Scaffold this active site. Sequence first.
Site, PDB file in Angstrom:
ATOM      1  N   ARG A   1      16.248   4.055  23.953  1.00  0.00           N
ATOM      2  CA  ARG A   1      16.547   3.063  24.987  1.00  0.00           C
ATOM      3  C   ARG A   1      17.526   3.617  26.010  1.00  0.00           C
ATOM      4  O   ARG A   1      17.444   3.289  27.200  1.00  0.00           O
ATOM      5  CB  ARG A   1      17.109   1.777  24.373  1.00  0.00           C
ATOM      6  CG  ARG A   1      16.146   1.007  23.461  1.00  0.00           C
ATOM      7  CD  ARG A   1      14.771   0.934  24.083  1.00  0.00           C
ATOM      8  NE  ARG A   1      13.807   0.146  23.324  1.00  0.00           N
ATOM      9  CZ  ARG A   1      13.027   0.628  22.364  1.00  0.00           C
ATOM     10  NH1 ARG A   1      13.096   1.916  22.020  1.00  0.00           N
ATOM     11  NH2 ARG A   1      12.164  -0.180  21.755  1.00  0.00           N
TER      12      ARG A   1
ATOM     13  N   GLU B   1      15.637   5.925  28.138  1.00  0.00           N
ATOM     14  CA  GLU B   1      14.769   5.180  29.043  1.00  0.00           C
ATOM     15  C   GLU B   1      15.548   4.645  30.240  1.00  0.00           C
ATOM     16  O   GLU B   1      15.030   4.611  31.363  1.00  0.00           O
ATOM     17  CB  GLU B   1      14.089   4.042  28.287  1.00  0.00           C
ATOM     18  CG  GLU B   1      13.184   3.192  29.160  1.00  0.00           C
ATOM     19  CD  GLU B   1      12.356   2.209  28.368  1.00  0.00           C
ATOM     20  OE1 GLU B   1      11.295   2.598  27.823  1.00  0.00           O
ATOM     21  OE2 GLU B   1      12.767   1.039  28.291  1.00  0.00           O
TER      22      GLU B   1
ATOM     23  N   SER C   1      30.205  13.999  37.315  1.00  0.00           N
ATOM     24  CA  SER C   1      30.331  15.011  36.278  1.00  0.00           C
ATOM     25  C   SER C   1      30.071  14.419  34.899  1.00  0.00           C
ATOM     26  O   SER C   1      30.457  13.283  34.610  1.00  0.00           O
ATOM     27  CB  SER C   1      31.727  15.635  36.327  1.00  0.00           C
ATOM     28  OG  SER C   1      32.069  16.252  35.102  1.00  0.00           O
TER      29      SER C   1
END
Lengths: 155, 155, 155, 155, 155, 155, 155, 155, 155, 155
Positions: free
Chosen positions: H95, H98, H121
Amino acid sequence: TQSLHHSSSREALTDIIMDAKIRKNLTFEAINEGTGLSLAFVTAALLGQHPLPEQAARVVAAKLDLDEDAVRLLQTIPLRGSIPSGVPTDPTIYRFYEMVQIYGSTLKALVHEQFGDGIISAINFKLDIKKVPDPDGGERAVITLDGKYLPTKPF
Amino acid sequence: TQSLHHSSSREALTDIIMDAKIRKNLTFEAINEGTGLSLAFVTAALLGQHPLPEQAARVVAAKLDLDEDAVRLLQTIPLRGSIPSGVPTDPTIYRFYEMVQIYGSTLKALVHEQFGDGIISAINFKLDIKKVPDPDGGERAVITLDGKYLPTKPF
Amino acid sequence: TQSLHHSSSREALTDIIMDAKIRKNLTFEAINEGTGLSLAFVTAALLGQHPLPEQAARVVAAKLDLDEDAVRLLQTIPLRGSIPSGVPTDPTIYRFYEMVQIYGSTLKALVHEQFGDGIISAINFKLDIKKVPDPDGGERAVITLDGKYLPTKPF
Amino acid sequence: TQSLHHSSSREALTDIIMDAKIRKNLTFEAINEGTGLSLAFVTAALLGQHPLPEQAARVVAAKLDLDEDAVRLLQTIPLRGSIPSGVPTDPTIYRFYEMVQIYGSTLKALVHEQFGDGIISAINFKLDIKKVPDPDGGERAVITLDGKYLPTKPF
Amino acid sequence: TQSLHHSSSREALTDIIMDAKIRKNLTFEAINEGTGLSLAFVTAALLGQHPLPEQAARVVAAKLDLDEDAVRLLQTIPLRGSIPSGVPTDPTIYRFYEMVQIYGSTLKALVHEQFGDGIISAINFKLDIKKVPDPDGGERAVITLDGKYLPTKPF
Amino acid sequence: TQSLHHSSSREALTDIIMDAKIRKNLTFEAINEGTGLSLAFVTAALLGQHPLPEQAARVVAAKLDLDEDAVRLLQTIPLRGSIPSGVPTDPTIYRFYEMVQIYGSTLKALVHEQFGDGIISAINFKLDIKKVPDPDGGERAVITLDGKYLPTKPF
Amino acid sequence: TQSLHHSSSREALTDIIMDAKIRKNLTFEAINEGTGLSLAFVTAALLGQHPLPEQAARVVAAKLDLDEDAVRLLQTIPLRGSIPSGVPTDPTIYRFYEMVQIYGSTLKALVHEQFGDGIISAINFKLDIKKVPDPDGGERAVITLDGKYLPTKPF
Amino acid sequence: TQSLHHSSSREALTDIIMDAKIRKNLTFEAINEGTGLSLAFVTAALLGQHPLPEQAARVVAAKLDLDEDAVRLLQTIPLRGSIPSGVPTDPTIYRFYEMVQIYGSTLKALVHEQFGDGIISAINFKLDIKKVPDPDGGERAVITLDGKYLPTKPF
Amino acid sequence: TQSLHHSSSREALTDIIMDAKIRKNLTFEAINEGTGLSLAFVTAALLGQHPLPEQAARVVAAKLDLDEDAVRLLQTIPLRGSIPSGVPTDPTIYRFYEMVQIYGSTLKALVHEQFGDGIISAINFKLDIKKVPDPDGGERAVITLDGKYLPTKPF
Amino acid sequence: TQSLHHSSSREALTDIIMDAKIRKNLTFEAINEGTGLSLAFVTAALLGQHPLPEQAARVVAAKLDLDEDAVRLLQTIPLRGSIPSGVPTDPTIYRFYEMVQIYGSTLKALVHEQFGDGIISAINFKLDIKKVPDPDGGERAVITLDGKYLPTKPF
């Protein structure tokens, strides 16, 4: 013999061939009448996997209304390979890949047992597919792979 | 039926089988004596791709001097797959893969033409390999793929 | 039956179908009104995964104002596969891929326990999706995979 | 809840579980007796894809003759995923993967048509497999995927 | 002839072979003394890519203090493949891969022009490497690939 | 020296070169007339893998009816690589890849034994292919890889 | 709701959107002025990862002088995914991939510790980016990920 | 500082850490008591992604009853990376991947808009995870990514 | 600052840039005259990897006769990445990849020894290449990678 | 010279080396005392990427208390490659890979402009890393790649 460096030119022709085949509602067996060659070889050529001899190139081009440029390109050796993904996603082609995936080790083992070290050739090679009845109802396909044994010997 | 979640324990048994086979200098045909089954099926079972019926598992374990634990494991369904790399590197196996790579789309087209939409099954399926002489000198392998046609029908 | 060597000509038709569908603000259900077939099968066919019989092809063509070349192509068997990458990035499709990734070994284990050696077919197979109320509020989708058991038997 | 960072230590327990299962000729259904949980979920846990609550972990550990370390490890959340390659080679697992490959774009399309933007969850989700007779002979598996609809809404 | 289903039993022997070689400070040329075989073939065999005849297996085993188990395994056909990644990272091996990447299309073109359709065999094939001086200082390697032309003919 | 950032522009020229070659029924040897360069180098340049000196570029442009834009692009250094897939599917090309796959570790071992630590250069390198009549009937291809030994060496 | 089957059609619209944005020297914040929605959601929509509701789609179309076809396509659910390669090469995007690569196992461990088994949703989910000063000079981005916890409960 | 060249010795230690953590039924928050460091940093160090200062290393080792070898290894810089497969299969980790997959292009776009060319960064960077109640019922995770802006300036 | 979503519109400009540079037979140093920026940065920008400030953008645009649409697009931040394959096949680029492949763990080990935990930045970073004579005849390339050290500190 | 066929044997030595280095709290600089060789070459050798001359091998073994078998293994040519994944996940190493990803096409372009067709060698090659102050505070690493130019000449 002329050969192709990339699939692009032979793929373009294959699309044109398939467009005419569908538009005319023709079978490959109909397209192959008068070639003097096996259906499996000429079907592969039309799908971009083999060159055709001139006579075979002109007879399929006559049935598909293809021009002289298509006759010349049909006689050129292509960059071969029908499964660019390496492993197919289409279920029909996948089943044939699966046969090799399951029995690959067995075929190697029995080739080495019955023939010796080496390979069964895929170039000195002929392929046939035959429709037979199934004794329990339905149809079966008998696909015959016929390859020359090439030994591996110490040198 | 008992099944396996991994290929490793069946791989360990396969290593024990091949060791006993090499130590006894046995062929797969000799090991298959008296099973009542095809050499292609039983060889694939030994190489971890199939379970064996109980009578065949005991008769192979008797030839290879395997214990009762091997008998039970030979009767368990494996996680199948002879080519974990997807495409083989071993030349003998690669030739069979290349046959599918070259003729994959032709087999699809001709299956759809002569049978219809759908597949030729790799489960309702039998494999065979026979050595025939080459008319131009040498030996040839005739491998037969015999699968049921399963139609794809609109629903 | 007509088949397609690659999906891009079917991809182009799929693009035209989706473009007409959006412009007319049509649902797949509305497009499917006169096909006499299941919504799951015909939506897949419109998305390039199945052929349609002629009359079903004509009724989606009348809905989407497609021409006779589209009717002929809709009747051709495509090169199947809806997820080119093998693994989707789209969340909606990925969840279905995830169900197979999580429960794939459980499905094999229980198929072998409850049916035996072999497969549940993805060809002798029908798919359905149904919306049901969630007792705790909201909605749920019930997707039904219905496939024939094909045994693996010794040969 | 305790969780794992890698597949390995849960893989070792899964190996021990499958070894004890085969040695005792136990079905997953007999191992699941008295857990109060569904066969699909408990089978997945035994195969490394789920934790078990304590009482379920103790009853499978008693049936399989596992020690207290196993009980604790069975209650740990694993690093999930039953198909390490992403694409299975095993035919039984591959068929379910094929179902998603073929109907993935269809499932997304009908989810958005019938539910709206968003997903069918793979977590608020239950799975069931049922054996039924095929009216024309044989058996069929009815696999039900039951997931919550989670909308994607503009924010 | 005995074959092997995977790399590990030969891999373990290859490490044993290499370990003894380094301990005894032997060259492959010294190990190959008296076999009557080419240095490229025997080195490949010792690296797990070829079987050896019994005489050469017992000869290399005498020079490396290997037991009769090693003699038998050196006579078995391995699962072939020296680069598991398919593409090497080692610079020395990669340069030969780079030669094929750069000149692959050229060799295909020139093979078809000078020989015809078909392949240059990798099985009816022998390899040689020779050290020659460079006219502008230094040394050069002349690697000779010698393979039989197998035509692809229409059937 | 002008160099290309991609394969795209040089690929388009290769298509035109191959189309002119097929139309005029010319060999690479015919196109190579009066260049003073080896057939393997100029063929690789025509296939988009090398730049040509202006004289050679104008020579082959004259025999293929190419314009000044082709003369200029033939003189530019391309982005090299003849096998985009890394591993070829074409059987002719694959056989050369398989020779490196099988003998890669042997070539590394023998380079280190006969030359020392380092590589055989793929840049300070020339390739040649010759047709050699095979003694047992048929023809053989002897392909020589001639690379400079570049030592790897402490610093 | 209308959905899309391929990335390309929205890709074309995204190119149009970006071209208009650059020509007019507009920021995403200016384009979002009258949508009534979050900058992060609308920017993702413009980049082809979300649909817009009708009135929000008309606002962005007025800022960018898009036509009614663009308005319609902006309301269609796309095939989602901003990194087709799976892992990005772009350094800005790669740093976010690297946070998950580094801390992925930590996030899983702490999610299971603080919430329990299951997931943090990526659908019932909002994202936000804020610019804050760095105490040691410079600026920092504070990206907030806000996802609903979905439990995995035995069933 | 001492650094590690590969995952394995830090892999084995992480296995030992998790083994002791599960056996003692400890939380990461309990293990972190008295380090003076953030839970996300220390958890990532225990999971093999970070070194610990000596006093933090000694207190986490004391909670888990690890020896002086573990204390020294915990202070060494590992070869970092929690997702060896590039894309995770575990749902909880997937997840978060994703999230970057969907919003990656949006993050880049809004970073360049609100900060300028360059990156946020992943090294001058802190991560935090927080559990909060959902007003609609349930819980949510609020993950904060806090990274320094580093500009790309022309040089 | 203006950013880009995908590579192609900037790729289309890079093709136009390269086409004009070849036709005019210009060097990158010539194109870079009067920009005030280093050749390495401006060459990367012309190759689609960097934005140019407006003066530098108008200078190169006058050198290659590009329109104002190219001037504005050259000022936009691209989706960066010069090797889409991840690993190059072009030998010139591959050698630089090989340097990281060979010495990557050494650079990490020596960065950590001489600086500490953390990274050498690729963003706060400058690149330079210079041609120097080789004392043994020929020429060498001295490529300087100048990156800021960013520490990883416990938080 | 002795060479190795796989990474494992040298990997095991590298593990032993790092264990003694950490246990003894040694730097690579202190291990490199008395070798007369540069830190970057010896560090890479200790990490399994280079052989060591006998004297250098004996001095690091005396510093690390390794036996004679390690001194001989340190003198053998390894199978090189420090990034088995092809693309690293470790951030320190990834930054160096990112430098080539970003500037790869620029380096090729400038190499061909300033040197000509051909490569900058990764074998006739020296690497160095130095710590210099940053004029804005902090430190920077200057990594010098020094490779011989090898031209591609027509042949």
